[PDB]
Amino acid sequence: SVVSIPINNAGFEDPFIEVVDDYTVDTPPGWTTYNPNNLVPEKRTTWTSNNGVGYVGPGTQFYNQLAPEGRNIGFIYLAQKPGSGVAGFEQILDATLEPDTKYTLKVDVGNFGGEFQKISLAGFPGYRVELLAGDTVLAADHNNLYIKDGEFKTSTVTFTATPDNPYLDQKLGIRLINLLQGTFSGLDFDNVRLTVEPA
């Protein structure tokens, strides 16, 4: 009844990262950078706005648990002040929107804690998880879960497409967004899952 829709690098496991608490600052393979407000530069370093992948394993200062799936998470850090806009990850899938089908999108959202180069990582920017067809946000969880520093929680987004939906046959998409509505203005995501079932 319930079928999984394939997602590339759905757990941010590519690339492999060896050293505890290490990270990349380039867009994770299989994803693109969602950048509607031009907050993230094309060339990134540690302290520019950025996104990438990070290893969360034993030894980590960031959570009271390990990565929800595998070794790694995906993260977005925004250096601009709260209110400046949003940015995140986007992936357009090969699957298309089909009628009489209920879609369930799940992703784990992480509010890491700790301290980085004497800067407190306490606080959280807020998140939004979106399911798309074409350019249209069909359904989204805008920041409904309370996630304390050092923990992950699972966001669930659902959508049912009827035969009259204007966006049938358009490509499905997923966005994972840093809302930049608080500091420390970084957050993590892991274990993106998309399933389908009859409406």
Q: State the nearest-atom distance from the C-beta of 47 to a second copy, in Å.
A: 21
Q: Is 83 among the annotated ligand-binding positions?
A: no
Q: Are 145 and 108 in contact (CB under 8 A)?
A: no
* Contact partner at residue 166 from a second copy, Ca ion, none, CB < 5 to 8 Å by partner kind: a second copy
Please enumerate in sequence order all residues whose Cβ is within 8 A of that of 168, keeping only pairs 6 or more positions apart, or say none.
96, 97, 98, 99, 133, 161
* 149 is a site residue for Ca ion (CB under 5 A): yes
Nearest to 135 by CA among 87, 171, 165: 171
* Contact partner at residue 141 from Ca ion, a second copy, none, CB < 5 to 8 Å by partner kind: a second copy
What is the three-class DSSP state of 152? strand
- Please state, as a whole number, how many other Cβ atoms lie within 10 Å of the Cβ of residue 6: 9
**Which of 9, 11, 55, 110 is in the footprint of Ca ion by CB under 5 A?**
11
- First vs last C-alpha separation in the chain: 11
Q: State the nearest-atom distance from the C-beta of 70 to a second copy, in Å.
A: 28
**Cα–Cα dist 103/14, whole Å:** 26
* Contact partner at residue 170 from Ca ion, a second copy, none, CB < 5 to 8 Å by partner kind: none
* Contact partner at residue 182 from Ca ion, a second copy, none, CB < 5 to 8 Å by partner kind: a second copy
User: Can you name the residues that pair with 195 across neighbouring β-strands?
Assistant: 4, 104
Q: State the nearest-atom distance from the C-beta of 149 to Ca ion, in Å.
A: 5
Which is nearer to a second copy, 30 or 182 (by Cβ)? 182
Binding residue ranges for Ca(2+): 11, 13, 22-23, 42, 69, 72, 111-112, 121, 123, 135, 149, 152, 190
